[PDB]
Amino acid sequence: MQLSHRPAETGDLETVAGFPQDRDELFYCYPKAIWPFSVAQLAAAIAERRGSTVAVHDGQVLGFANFYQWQHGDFCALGNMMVAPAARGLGVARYLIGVMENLAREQYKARLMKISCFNANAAGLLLYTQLGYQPRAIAERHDPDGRRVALIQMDKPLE
């Protein structure tokens, strides 16, 4: 894979809004979004966030990430992290998380990255574990059916 990145652009949003492939994946990234996900909902999320970035390979937008929180000198919290359904398992998220860690260091002088992941998202938990994030706490949340779920809060020092 020859991946590159750049800031997200308007023309990328139609593609990116298609990355959650079912209500579970939608929930994992946008727990208050309504199915189907739409560009208006994605734009609304981006508006609240910083550092929206896309990963590109062979002319295709395959990954998207941003920051949910950013505290200069202190930490950033990874927000959205989504990969095109046809390109999973190929290292796109590993790549883009690395990019976002560099951006955290460079633009915010962060010394820590925080992530949180819903309990049902095994791929997400394993991703972050593989990248050296450690679990710190677990919080109760609710899904769109009002069922109780566990949000696993993790972090990693940035060097």
Ligand SMILES: *SCCNC(=O)CCNC(=O)[C@H](O)C(C)(C)COP(=O)(O)OP(=O)(O)OC[C@H]1O[C@@H](n2cnc3c(N)ncnc32)[C@H](O)[C@@H]1OP(=O)(O)O
């Ligand atoms: S916004 C909340 C998080 N995002 C989502 O839940 C959105 C839906 N999921 C996805 O977009 C992708 O499945 C994510 C979770 C973003 C993973 O993206 P990639 O497929 O690009 O992951 P990489 O190929 O970079 O893999 C890095 C490590 O991640 C773990 N992992 C990925 N996929 C799986 C599955 N299917 N099952 C178990 N573990 C998975 C692995 O630890 C992987 O490391 P390896 O070295 O490949 O083992």
